Every structure is written in C-alpha cells, then in structure tokens.
C-alpha cells in the first residue's frame, strides 16, 4: 500500500524574505531515507535522513530567499521502495 | 534484559510442515525493532529468510528464495514470533536463529537466539 | 535485487597482524544500515560494528570499520587467536526482491 506522506511547512507556506521556513514531511516508522522534490528542478531537489522515531525527516531554510519558492513534493524511502508523493506544498515568498 | 528464546525444532520429513517459535522473554526501551529469521545451512553461508516489524502494519519482508514457502506471524496473546515452513525440502536442513534490530541501532541485531536444528529427513 | 559481496572469501593472517575485510554493494547505501558480524564456529552470530563504524556493546577496540555508498571496510587492528571466525556484512536500506541481506563471509584463519 505505502501511505503517501504528508508535508507541510513551519510557521508557515507564505514566508517573507530572509527569515526561516521548516519544511515537514511524515511518513511510517520504517522510512529509511526521505527526499525533496521541487518542480522544474532536477530531482532530488534535497535528501535527508529520518529523525527518531523515523516518523518524520526534516528540511530546514535558515534564511527564505527566492530560489526556495516553488512547489516541493517529499517522498519517503520504505524498505521496499519510493512511496507516492505528497500533496503538493507551494512555498511562496513576499 | 530481553531473551529471545527459540522452540519448534527437530526432525521433520520431506515434503511436510514445521513452525519455529521465538519467545522474546521480557523487554527493555525498544518499541520499535524487527524481528529477523535467519538459517545457517550445513558449513554454508548465513541465509536472511525475513522479518516482521513490531508496529501495528506488522510488515513482513522475505527474502526472494523464502516467498511461498515461508510465512512469519506474530502472536502478541503470548508474546511470540512464528516462522510458519511449508513443503520442507532436504536442503532446508539448517540451524534458525532469530534476532531483533531495534530503530535506535538502524535495524541492527544486537539480540540473537541461541538456535534451534530443524533437519528434514524420512 | 541488492547482492552484497566481501572479500576475500579466505584469508591467513599471522597473530598481532592488521587485517582489512571488504564489503562491496550491488548499489549504493545509506552508512547507517550497514552492519558487520562476527560467528565463531558453532555459536551464534554476533554484532561487532553498526552504521557501518559504530563499535557495539563489549566489542573488544581492535575492531573497527568505515565506508560510504558502495564501499565498506572492517579492520581488525592486532589479531588474535580467538579472532578466528567467520565475517558477515549486512544492510538494512533495501529488502524485497532481495536474495539475502548477507555477504557471502569473510572466513579468518590464523597463521601460525
């Protein structure tokens, strides 16, 4: 089945110019590696290790500047293979 | 301290059908590892069969030899791990061992069990 | 599938000697899902090494290993008699369709 994840961004989708975003994605207990995929960029836009428990992985933008806007979409690695993506999470600058 | 005690070993024909337990005696801080079956053949290699995880999904995994013919259940009534082995040929003749990888270590057994001898003959 | 091979199969090493046991992937890893262990004849295995360079629980310190992506290393530092054994690396980064999630071994014969 592979539950697809869910992501989402800390404070907030809409960030202004240089102050910092957290971008969330969940998965299952057996993820072995997550990855951040942003579109019209080469995937993988980020990879990143699972946190513990393996629930979650973390991206993290100290200071939001205009290449980080777009739309990302995080897929979790199982034991198994590459999930399906998240629902699309667009991250907008003011 | 956690034990994984194993059990269900022994003499069994060709063709038949045999289940190994594996009792995991006590616990310590894990709530989240694996359970692995793993059989060493005769003077050969170590053989992973699969594992089954200890959340609720209960995922199990088996290796490309061991589907169909291997099963592994959980019995949480009791505690116990079962390694259900159908169609049992000769060359399954080997010691099984059961081991637990917690998520803390990234899935490496730390815990083995003692083993247990299962040799198929008529 | 993901085939793990080690080398050398066989190998004869004098005691105090520095021996070096290779684990190669079919793919690349993640470091941290890679494992090594040791089995004495008769016993049961034994976990010696975990994320690839991590010493576990009451491993004596002349074992070490190290490794990224394909590449994967144990070293034992000054070899001893009771070191005779037989060495298996293992992942935990893909399973399914996958034969077997050990190396092949790595059997340790001490010359004398």
């Known amino acids: 089945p592979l539950p697809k994840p869910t992501l989402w961004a800390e404070p907030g989708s809409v960030i202004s110019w240089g102050n910092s975003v957290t971008i969330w994605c969940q998965g299952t207990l057996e993820a072995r590696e997550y990855r951040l995929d942003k579109e019209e960029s080469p995937a993988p836009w980020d990879r990143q290790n699972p946190l513990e428990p393996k629930n979650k992985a973390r991206f993290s933008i100290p200071s939001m500047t205009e290449d980080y806007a777009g739309r990302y979409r995080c897929y979790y690695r199982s034991p198994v293979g590459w999930s399906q993506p998240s629902d699309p999470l667009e991250l907008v600058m003011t | 301290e956690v034990q994984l005690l194993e059990s269900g070993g022994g003499l069994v024909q060709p063709g038949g059908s045999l289940r190994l337990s594996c009792a995991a005696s006590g616990i310590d801080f894990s709530n989240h590892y694996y359970m692995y079956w793993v059989r060493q053949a005769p003077g050969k290699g170590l053989e992973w069969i699969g594992s089954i995880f200890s959340g609720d999904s209960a995922s199990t995994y088996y290796a490309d030899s061991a589907k169909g013919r291997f099963t592994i259940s959980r019995d949480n009534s009791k505690n116990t791990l079962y390694l259900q082995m159908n169609s049992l040929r000769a060359e399954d003749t080997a010691v099984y061992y059961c081991?637990?990888?917690?998520?803390?270590?990234?899935?490496?057994?730390?815990?083995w069990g003692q083993g247990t001898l299962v040799t198929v003959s008529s | 599938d993901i085939q793990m091979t080690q080398s050398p199969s066989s190998l004869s090493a004098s005691v105090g000697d520095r021996v070096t046991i290779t684990c190669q992937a079919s793919?690349?890893?993640?470091?941290?899902?890679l494992a090594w262990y040791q089995q004495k004849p008769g016993k049961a295995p034994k976990l010696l090494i975990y994320r690839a360079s991590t010493l576990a629980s009451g491993v004596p310190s002349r074992f070490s290993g190290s490794g990224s992506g394909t590449d994967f290393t144990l070293t034992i530092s000054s070899l001893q008699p009771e070191d005779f054994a037989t060495y298996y690396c293992?992942?935990?980064?893909?399973?399914?369709?996958?034969?077997?999630?050990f190396g092949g071994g790595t059997k340790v014969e001490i010359k004398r």
């Open positions: 793919e690349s890893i993640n470091s941290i899902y």
């Open positions: 081991a637990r990888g917690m998520s803390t270590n990234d899935w490496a057994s730390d815990l």
């Open positions: 293992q992942q935990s980064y893909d399973w399914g369709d996958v034969e077997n999630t």
